[PDB]
Amino acid sequence: ESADLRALAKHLYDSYIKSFPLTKAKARAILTGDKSPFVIYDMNSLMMGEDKIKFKHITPLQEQSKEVAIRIFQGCQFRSVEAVQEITEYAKSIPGFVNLDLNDQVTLLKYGVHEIIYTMLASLMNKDGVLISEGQGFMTREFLKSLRKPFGDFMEPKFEFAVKFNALELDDSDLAIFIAVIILSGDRPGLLNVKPIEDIQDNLLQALELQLKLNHPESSQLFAKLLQKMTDLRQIVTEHVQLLQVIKKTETSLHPLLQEIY
């Protein structure tokens, strides 16, 4: 299967490039240095970001959008909903995924997206900030903590995680297989037929292993260090879910249909 593990690597990688717009390599050239991004570092660079970046897709809903930080978080959610559809599409590219019990595919997706969103979010951030709206922007890190209430402490966890994660220096070729592994997680609650999901992940894990040893001769035991990060992820996700609690001690095209889209 030495060749059968490359076939799978190349294939996943192709679906990855086709399902995701902004890639690792991509977002990396931007973060480090033609068309520089618009940096959001304070209140005015944001108010100015609204129109300029036109990312406003998430804003136009007049009457609700009137308090900063609610509008940023609201934007964290619109792009998230977007990404879920991209993740879902990538899933179907994973050999055997489509052939599983439909309830399980939904279940795998229901619990795998949050882990996949943070993994990729790392591709878009550095110790100093995160790339937003397709790459047209860069919302600084300090500004994010500059948000108040539980808001100014929800992005700082992910920055800490991203820093450790990106240190592994993984590329799109690598992440593609990693993303799939997370999806084919046989321990998600409510699964009806775990065997098939495990066979697939294992077949995926072999390919990831071969992928990491060929692409990073230099880094000993990278396979192991990467699998360990799945721990940081679960904490990051459980933590995140807690943040969604207090944010209820906050509020709660008219909103009555927005709430239902999320």
Ligand X SMILES: CCCCCCCCc1ccc2n1[B-](F)(F)[N+]1=C(CCCCC(=O)O)C=CC1=C2
Residues forming a β-bridge with 138: 39
Q: What number of chain residues touch a second copy (CB under 8 A)? A: 19
Locus of tokens 């860069």 = 138
What is the spatial distance between Cα 183 and Cα 120, in angstroms, rounded to a whole number?
14
Q: Binding partner of residue 75 among ligand X, a second copy, none, CB under 5 to 8 Å per kind?
A: ligand X
| DSSP single-letter state for residue 139 | E
Nearer to a second copy by C-beta: 79 or 213? 213
Which of a second copy, ligand X, none does residue 164 bind (CB under 5 to 8 Å by kind)?
A: a second copy
Region 152-191 residues binding a second copy, contact defined as CB under 8 A: 164, 187
Task: State the nearest-atom distance from the C-beta of 196 to a second copy, in Å.
Answer: 15
Q: Taking CB under 6 A as the rule, does residue 79 contact ligand X?
A: yes
Determine if 80 is a binding residue for ligand X (CB under 6 A): yes
H or E element, residue 92: none
List, as one string, the DSSP characters of 17-56: HHH-SS-HHHHHHHHH-----EEE-SHHHHHHHHHHT-GG
Given the complex with ligand X, which of 76 and 243 has the nearer CB atom?
Answer: 76
Of the pair 171, 209, the CB lying nearest a second copy is at 209
Is residue 159 a contact residue for ligand X (CB under 6 A)?
Answer: no
Instruction: Find where tokens 């321990």 sit.
Output: 187
In angstroms, give the least distance from the CB of 125 to ligand X.
9
Dihedral Cα 102, 188, 80, 171, nearest 10 deg? -100
Q: Which does residue 228 bind out of a second copy, ligand X, none, counting CB within 5 to 8 angstroms by kind?
A: a second copy
* Of residues 22 and 230, the one with the C-beta less far from a second copy: 230
Helix intervals (H) in the chain: 4-19, 24-32, 43-52, 70-91, 102-121, 141-145, 155-166, 172-183, 194-215, 222-246
Residues 199-228 that bind a second copy (CB under 8 A): 202, 205-206, 209, 220-221, 223-225, 227-228
User: Could you say whether residue 235 binds a second copy (CB under 8 A)?
Assistant: yes
Which residue pairs from 45-54 have beta carbons closer than 8 angstroms and sit at least 24 positions apart in sequence?
Answer: 45/143, 46/72, 46/143, 49/137, 53/133, 53/136, 53/137
Contact residue for a second copy among 39, 230, 243, 247 (CB under 8 A): 230
- What gap in Å lies between CA 234 and CA 18, rounded to an integer? 27
- The residue type found at 34 is D
| Residue 138: contacted member of ligand X, a second copy, none (CB under 5 to 8 Å, by partner type) | none
Contact positions vs a second copy (CB under 8 A): 164, 187, 202, 205-206, 209, 220-221, 223-225, 227-228, 230-232, 234-235, 238
Residues forming the annotated binding site? 77-80, 114, 240, 262
Contact positions vs ligand X (CB under 6 A): 20-22, 55, 58, 72, 75-76, 79-80, 83, 86-87, 116-117, 120-121, 124, 130, 132-133, 139, 155
